[PDB]
Amino acid sequence: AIAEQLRAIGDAF
Amino acid sequence: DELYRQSLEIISRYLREQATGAKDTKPMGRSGATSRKALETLRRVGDGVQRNHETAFQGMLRKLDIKNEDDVKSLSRVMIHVFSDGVTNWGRIVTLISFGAFVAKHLKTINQESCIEPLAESITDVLVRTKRDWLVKQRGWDGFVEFFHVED
Ligand SMILES: *NC(=O)c1cc([SH](*)(=O)O)ccc1OC
Ligand SMILES: *CCC/C=C\CCC*
């Protein structure tokens, strides 16, 4: 699941 | 409009420079100072995203197996899907552009460098069409630059 990973990294940033 | 042109210019310049290692020498269009600061911000912040999450980005690229202007369409659906939980923030936006740069580098290495153009277009469309209202409310690229500004 790509979208979930991108979301996670964007929320930390 | 202008927001679309400015966004495509910034994102295209970043992705092309990331792929080739060549800074484009030509002048920016309107609102050039904001665009130059946005590029400075992408260089600095995008470096932190890509290095903190390099292994995951590699695995994402493997999954997608992007090798054609058409795997980029699959990526566009994924990128729209990021925002489908109703959450928007500048971190998610910088992360999508950073992953775009990671893909642009891969496209160059497999000799599909001209696909960086539709890639930049697809990322731009998510910001200026899908998330237009949020982008405008948050002051566009000036808001992006301010969010990531380096404190004295
Ligand atoms: N794996 C994913 O991140 C992903 C996420 C959604 S979305 O509803 O976040 C939908 C499908 C997924 O992968 C197949
Ligand atoms: C999508 C989860 C990312 C995990 C950590 C970093 C948050 C900025």
Numbering used by the authors:
A (entry chain B): 2 to 14
B (entry chain A): 172 to 323
Paper text:
hMcl-1 is often overexpressed in cancer, where it confers resistance to chemotherapy or radiation. However, two His residues, namely, His 252 and His 224, are present in the BH3 binding pocket of Mcl-1 and could be therefore targeted perhaps more efficiently with covalent agents compared to Lys 234. His residues are particularly attractive yet underexplored for covalent drug design given that they, unlike Lys, are usually unprotonated at physiological pH, which should facilitate a nucleophilic addition at the imidazole ring.
To further elucidate the binding conformation of the covalent agent to hMcl-1(172–323) and to more unambiguously identify the covalently targeted residue, we determined the X-ray structure of compound 155H1 in complex with hMcl-1(172–323). As anticipated by previous characterizations, we found that the N-terminal residue formed a covalent bond with the side chain of His 252, as observed by a contiguous electron density between the aryl-sulfonyl group and the imidazole ring of His 252 with whom the group formed a stable sulfonamide. In the final refined model, the density and placement of covalently bound 155H1 in the hMcl-1(172–323) structure were well resolved in its entirety. The general peptide-hMcl-1(172–323) interactions appeared well maintained in the crystal structure, in which the amphipathic helical peptide was inserted into the peptide-binding pocket with its hydrophobic side chains buried in the pocket, while the peptide’s only Asp residue was involved in a salt bridge with hMcl-1(172–323) residue Arg 263. These interactions are typically well conserved between BH3 peptides and hMcl-1(172–323)12 as well as in other BH3/Bcl-2 protein complexes. However, as anticipated earlier, the agents can also interact covalently with Lys 234 when His 252 was mutated to Ala. However, when the protein was exposed to stapled covalent agent 155H1, resonances of the binding site His 224 further broadened beyond detection, while the cross-peaks for the imidazole resonances of His 252 were dramatically shifted for all 3 observed resonances, presumably due to the formation of the covalent adduct with His 252. Likewise, a shift in the band was also appreciable when intact A549 cells were exposed to 155H1.
